[PDB]
Symmetry: C6
Subunit: 67 residues, 6 copies
């Protein structure tokens, strides 16, 4: 219950909001959240890549989003 | 029970205290805690970004805060 | 239940899709997913090496794949 | 049960022993353990900052301490 | 159940296969898997050292191995 | 059950074997295992410091040890 991560990612996915996912190695990825589960997020643009959440620092939308 | 993280973050959120969140990659973020849950914190200023706690080193308020 | 990681990796394995596995240390590996379990993925080419998921940032297929 | 971390940190807190907390990013912090819980330690000096244990390498007291 | 890590490491141990264990800090170790458990692997050559799995990126055998 | 980490560390502690603990940040520590629990090891020499296991890569004894 009392989850914030699910509502957040689900909004970004539903509204097709472009995001930057900054990784713990300094790599910045860019795409749309196509899908997400317990341990991974699927980020689309050219191909859909599987990002491990443990590797993510911050999810930054290109636009403000509201829950 | 016996939690310290929840009371701490909830105070920073309630009192809108400006914080620095230092990440494990040396990146320093700055904003207000808008919201927080089990695995993430939502830090606001320009847009509300989702920070993974596993990526956080230290939360540093701009002012002393008391529990 | 509601898993996305298993369907994703199983597709890449079944269709023998070439992938890049980017590690949290900046190392890029390349091979085919031969096998995967709870904590590891087995990536084949010259020899089959065991990659720990906690060390993985992103799995990137050489081709789009559909679930 | 059979805990060593709690007795250790509680001693440092009770005796107000100055410590260095070395982080996994090479950052050295310095303060007094004001408080600690399951996932975080609160280190005081100028303001009380919340340090995530997953970000900590070693806790080093300025003086020997005994359990 | 459905484990792949145990069968893999147990084969390398049984057949005394020389391996490279690449760590998340870029350090490459070399030895034989003497033993392994839930959280650690014991790698032998000059002395038997205890490697934490959370620190391991990939296990790479010097020869192909089959399960 | 079927633990290898406990027997290993307990031997090093009992026999006062000098060890190098290599950390995931490249820092090499040196001391004697004074004590250990679920998440930490206490390494003695000048003062007894608390090392978090999640920060440890490998434990390397100065001498071979047998279980
Ligand atoms: O139910 C869960 C379990 C894990 N995680 C995320 O996956 C990461 C990887 O887990 P592992 O490294 O313990 C965690 O740090 C956390 O951010 C979740 O979002 N939900
Ligand atoms: O109930 C929980 C679970 C996890 N965490 C935090 O989320 C991080 C990511 O978990 P994962 O990497 O195992 C943990 O290190 C811890 O700081 C909490 O604050 N509360
Ligand atoms: O049932 C599980 C448990 C763990 N993991 C992955 O293995 C990583 C290593 O777990 P540990 O570091 O807590 C996790 O971050 C997560 O990505 C899974 O995919 N499924
Ligand atoms: O009951 C607990 C749970 C976790 N931790 C510490 O918090 C860290 C973050 O947990 P997460 O990254 O799985 C762990 O590595 C461990 O050092 C504890 O001290 N006690
Ligand atoms: O039953 C288990 C528990 C953990 N691990 C490994 O030990 C690592 C350290 O766990 P901790 O960092 O949550 C995990 O990422 C995973 O690779 C296993 O192989 N089996
Ligand atoms: O019963 C346990 C739990 C955790 N750990 C170690 O503590 C580390 C920190 O746990 P946390 O980061 O999930 C794990 O990776 C593992 O090496 C153990 O040795 N035994
Ligand atoms: Mg690092």
């Amino acid at each position: 219950g009392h989850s914030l991560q699910d509502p957040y990612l689900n909004t970004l996915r539903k509204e097709r909001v472009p995001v930057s996912i900054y990784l713990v190695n300094g790599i910045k990825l860019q795409g749309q959240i196509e899908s997400f589960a317990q341990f991974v997020i699927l980020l689309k643009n050219t191909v859909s890549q599987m990002v491990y959440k443990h590797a993510i620092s911050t999810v930054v939308p290109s636009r403000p989003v509201r829950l």
